[PDB]
Design a protein around this ligand. Structure first.
Ligand code: 8CW
Ligand code: 83Z
Ligand code: CA0
Ligand code: FE
Ligand code: FE
Lengths: 674, 677
């Protein structure tokens, strides 16, 4: 039994199903492969097309999952999709009425067209199974919990008809106990409030990271007008007929002005986040306190996108409601695509389930074999020096104790948004300056942002207060208090409220990462490391070896440890050996506007990425002429000859387009099949 | 007492408040001027920036209105805005949360800045009065009716809180009787249904025009699921949590598939439109039966964008519920902007009302004086031939009897969507072939589109059944039956169901136009002319002389009559003398896309208009080099020398771009400041 789980929209690589398709229309595209009830491969398409939270069809992710399982398309028994057929088709139909040129191609045709053109796979209609959205979520959260009975809560933005569902799980059987309608969505509320702080979709864990810095008293009574806790676990949210945002009209009325991009976060902003975070905690625990005593379950699985609110999770944990809580590492819509596979298996036959709680998220493609990795790093020789230590883990621990900030790339990439020892950036967790520098120089992000610690399983309770229910901490699902007497020791990973979004690494969850953290503690007295995700501000988590090296050279990391190799940047790196290649979304424009006296304005030159929310950048006339000559095989040095050679000015300008990922710069060739 | 009325959004000429601002966010921008209670001036901004139903701030319209009234900006005593301040500023706030780089400027700051930068007018804060949206509509519709009391129904898409409002009007007082919430919008219902026919915002009247071609029984039981008539004049519309459209999910579930661009209208399309039109009539008649009995009133003023549904208006007329029915020529938001002026006068002091019923929509800027018109037509000499007849009306009447289609441009331009004898295209109404002749070869639009007749006040009742009630027919607000014994005589202007959207021109509403139609009737025994708007598919109704000449040269009209001058197109017109100018929204672009093997794709060159829903067109490398050198003074022929000269190929390509209005092509200079009459 081999079943493919699918989620996302149906856009090709270079175009969208309608032009400029909005970024929220079936996002977080991914493919999951389960076989005999075990989850053998999972990767979000964002890692492969390099578009964060992409909507495009997860074609590459399917191909990558088939390869990791050693399977051909013909070997797959069923395909699940994380929404009912009528719902996705009605939304497609709506997009079509707004874009009268788009052909009427609905989801069944589009899935079968993508799989046939992109993999040579004629999917039979009988094998494609559509699935209720929260049923998919619930399966994913619950079957990977290691529990035989539980209460499953699914809260997200919305499914086909509900914003929240409560399930009873026993064995492999789900039983609905409750749902909440779409206009009560807590993910809708949280996204709605997020737009008031200059953020947009995807930024909601920044708002959650800002809330501890604020006082939830200021706007407590303002938010109180937007919801009412009712009896027997019910609640109402209170809408308006002004704008499609639940939060802005009332806060506008009260003098609150939405933050602009590039403006500092004022104390009024910090208090807003705090009040928002408190509201959602109040409602969810209201729901949970009720359904805990009503259904009788002492164990909770929490899924849906809202279950990535680690702060909420840490408060469910510290409440007394449950003895055991489980959260999947992908609880957002990519997790729901995995669930669709389990739900498809159950509709055609019986449902095989995992036999242990999921401990590792390391489920994507790997970097390659020892020899193709060494061969590909040779192709980067004009930019990097490489060492091969006897014990890279031992060497990396020493470098970490010397104050070096490392990139750490090993094995298969992490499914879900957190890095857990396979595509990580790590540093000493003790100096509070490391939070300031890694925020401002490395990840190039907002100073208020916290940093998550990884601690060994054996020293966890020496540092963090895990009391209350037993939660799973392998995937950074829970915010926990740092023990008061350790807060100054762990200055980089302790937040303003004394909490941390902790990962507890064990030999069974990540053997090599546990080795790194244990050996660091033997050298320093502190088996705790700072562990942020290995990506700059312009990209999702790095996937391939070329991704890892590109990101290392274009961020300000000290050393890269990739599959036992020690990589450092060359003194004077030679950008001219690198082969420029357009991304399928890369676009070059020469534009003239109206000018003074109804004239043609002066020319400008822009590179941009052709998707909703995609960035853009001005380029010189010289580089505009250079990038126009890109053929995918000629190096940047030989291309630059047609504008008179690769001057230092041009290489710097290219280096900045590279850092914003406007196009691919990598040595000739590629690593080859893994 | 001099009051400015404003409506629309606050975008500049060359950008929008937020980028690519949606075409629905405060549309049909217009300025209006009332002095001592009379509407002295009013033009929609679309006429001046040439963007149909534009949302941009109506700064030009304001300047035109001040000049037609001989007023300094500092002479204005109050400015009125057609929405309340919390509402527009809350919508702006929402646009600002979705575009976090947009400066936080709300409506009061934005109105003042457009008037200080654009006119030098430091607007005092105490002069700006914001007005409830259906209150503005109501004033416009009732103060021009000539009625001393009436029931007022305002039914549009949306105001701050309502989608329909019912008033009692006595003298100058409005008294609210009822309302319907936003989710019951019939305007919204109609626009939702328009999207399923491959059309969009601004095409509703096309959908109304298609409805007679179809049988409302096919989808009658399907629409019945979307609404319910209730007691006490209430109705419910039945939503869904699937998509922001009331109609599409149910029809998708029953196999209805929305029309694509360029597809022919199938019988199911025609039936859908018919069933859609039958529903809105049924509901609006259900509202009105109740409020005509309950208020007991015999006079009705109907306002809001839904009141441009002339089919609905005629059915209301043929119902025996009212004795009189009045409809303002601009019942869409441009009229709320006028009404906003009155409501500001009522708020700030006393409300002066119009003496008589409004008879003529001819409230815009005028073409110009006799001398400067002759001078400007001289600049156009390389492309046109011009005669100066002794009686142009008499010359025109014979031409029309001869079978020519005529451009007709006189005086001040018509407020509202209808052309009524000041910016019109006119032809013999008798031959049925003249429909496809003027549709397919002149307007260049769908052929099903029927054509409106203009009849004389004297002959009117000899051709149309104006019975049922006394409706005002000076603005084509009412569709009426054509008398069966005349339906064959009037072949170009009789729809498939026997009806017509009649203008009735009198010596009082439009003298010159009335003489024209009367004379043609003396020459033919049929005092009916076909009357359509003077504009091709890519522009609103023309405004300036250069607009009128441009439009004549880029359509296939036989003759143009413009202020007593007869203009025809030269055998070979000389495009080289026209001076190209960029419009503020013109963008010229060289584009490269991703190619195979991760390469750079092909350089495509294109011109486009940078506003939501604006057109675009591919251009040759040679025209791209030429257009990029446009300096706004040098002629096309002199610019063309930098690429080898204006070859016939380039002139054709430029001409096709001219025809789609991508840029302004016009002789050097302008007609100059429009002089005083
Ligand atoms: C113009 O036309 C329409 C317009 C609209 C609706 C429609 C139409 Cl047609 N009509 C339809 O039907 C939509 C259809 O159905 C659809 C696209 C459904 C997709 C699959 C659904 O995706 C899901 N299932 O919500 O994915 P999930 O990954 O689990 O979670 C994600 C949620 O969780 C929260 N969240 C994450 N992180 C934290 C944290 N750390 N703390 C607290 N909250 C957090 C997030 O904040 C977010 O709210 C997308 C969705 O919800 C949208 O906002 C993301 C609301 C979108 C609503 C609109 C655009 C108005
Ligand atoms: C994304 O943000 C949105 C989207 C919608 C609504 C609102 C908002 Cl903020 N909220 C309002 O309040 C709208 C406001 O009042 C407005 C533009 C009023 C003009 C003058 C009316 O004409 C609106 C209509 O009637 C329009 O049909 C032409 C249907 C529009 C529905 C929409 C534009 C859906
Ligand atoms: N704020 C606001 O809405 O302005 P507004 O007074 O100009 O009305 C526009 C509305 O009238 C509806 N509408 C326009 N023409 C229509 C027609 N011929 N039939 C029905 N509805 C129509 C249109 O589809 C849209 O819902
Ligand atoms: Fe979800
Ligand atoms: Fe309106």
């Amino acid at each position: 039994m081999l079943v493919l789980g699918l989620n996302g929209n149906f856009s090709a690589a270079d175009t969208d199903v309608v032009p400029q398709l909005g970024e929220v229309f079936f996002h977080d595209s991914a493919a999951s492969l389960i076989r005999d009830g075990e989850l053998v491969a999972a990767v979000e398409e964002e890692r492969l097309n390099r578009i964060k939270k992409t909507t495009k069809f997860p074609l590459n992710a399917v191909r990558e999952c088939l390869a990791l399982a050693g399977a051909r398309p013909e070997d797959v028994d069923a395909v699940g999709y994380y929404f009912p057929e009528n719902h996705i088709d009605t939304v497609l139909n709506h997009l079509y009425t707004e874009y009268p040129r788009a052909p009427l191609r609905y989801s069944r045709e589009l899935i079968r067209q993508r799989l046939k053109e992109g993999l040579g796979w004629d999917l039979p209609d009988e094998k494609l199974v559509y699935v209720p959205h929260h049923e998919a979520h619930a399966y994913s959260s619950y079957l990977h919990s290691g529990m035989d009975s539980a209460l499953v809560l699914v809260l997200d933005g919305r499914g086909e008809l509900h914003s929240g569902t409560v399930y009873r799980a026993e064995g492999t059987r789900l039983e609905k106990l409750a749902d909440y309608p779409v206009p009560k969505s807590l993910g809708g509320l949280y996204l709605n409030a997020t737009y008031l702080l200059g953020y947009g979709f995807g930024d909601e864990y920044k708002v959650m990271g800002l809330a501890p810095w604020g006082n939830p008293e200021t706007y407590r009574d303002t938010f109180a007008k937007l919801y009412t806790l009712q009896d027997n676990g019910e609640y109402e949210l209170h809408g308006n007929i002004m704008v499609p945002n639940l939060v802005s009209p009332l806060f506008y009325a009260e003098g609150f002005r939405p933050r602009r991009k590039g403006e500092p976060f004022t104390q009024a902003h910090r208090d807003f986040a705090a009040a928002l975070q408190e509201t959602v905690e109040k409602i969810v625990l209201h729901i949970l306190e009720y359904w805990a005593k009503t259904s009788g379950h002492s164990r909770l699985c929490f899924g849906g996108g809202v279950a990535h609110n680690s702060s909420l999770n840490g408060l469910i944990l510290k409440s007394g409601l449950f003895d055991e809580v489980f959260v999947h590492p992908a609880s957002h819509d990519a997790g729901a695509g995995e669930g669709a596979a389990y739900a498809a298996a159950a509709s055609l036959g019986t449902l095989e389930r995992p036999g242990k709680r999921l401990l590792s998220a390391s489920l994507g493609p790997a970097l390659g074999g020892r020899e193709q990795i060494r061969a590909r790093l040779a192709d980067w020789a004009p930019l990097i020096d490489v060492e091969f230590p006897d014990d890279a883990v031992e060497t990396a621990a020493g470098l970490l104790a010397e104050g070096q900030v490392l990139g750490w790339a090993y094995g298969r990439s992490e499914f879900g948004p957190r890095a857990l020892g396979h595509r990580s950036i790590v540093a000493d967790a003790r100096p509070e300056e490391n939070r300031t520098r890694i925020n401002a120089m490395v990840k190039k992000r907002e100073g208020f942002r916290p940093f998550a610690p990884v601690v060994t399983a054996e020293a966890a309770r020496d540092y963090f207060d895990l009391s209350g229910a037993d939660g799973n901490h392998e995937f950074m699902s829970f915010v926990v208090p740092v023990l008061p007497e350790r807060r100054t020791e762990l200055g980089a990973v302790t937040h303003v409220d004394g909490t941390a979004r902790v990962q507890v690494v064990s030999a069974e969850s990540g053997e090599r990462f546990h080795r790194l953290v244990r050996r660091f503690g033997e050298l320093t007295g502190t088996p705790v490391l700072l562990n942020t995700s290995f990506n700059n501000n312009a990209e999702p988590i790095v996937q391939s070896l070329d991704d890892v090296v590109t990101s290392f050279l274009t961020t300000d990391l000290d050393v890269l440890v990739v599959e036992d190799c020690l990589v450092r940047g060359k003194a004077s790196p030679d950008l001219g050996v690198l082969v420029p290649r357009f991304r399928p979304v890369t676009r070059l424009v020469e534009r003239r506007t109206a000018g003074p006296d109804a004239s043609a304005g002066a020319k400008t030159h822009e590179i941009h990425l052709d998707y909703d929310g995609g960035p853009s950048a001005k380029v010189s006339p010289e580089l505009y002429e250079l990038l126009g000559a890109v053929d995918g095989t000629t190096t940047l040095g030989d291309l630059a000859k047609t504008v008179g050679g690769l001057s230092d000015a041009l290489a710097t300008e290219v280096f900045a387009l590279w850092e914003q990922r406007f196009l691919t710069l990598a040595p000739a060739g590629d690593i080859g099949p893994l």
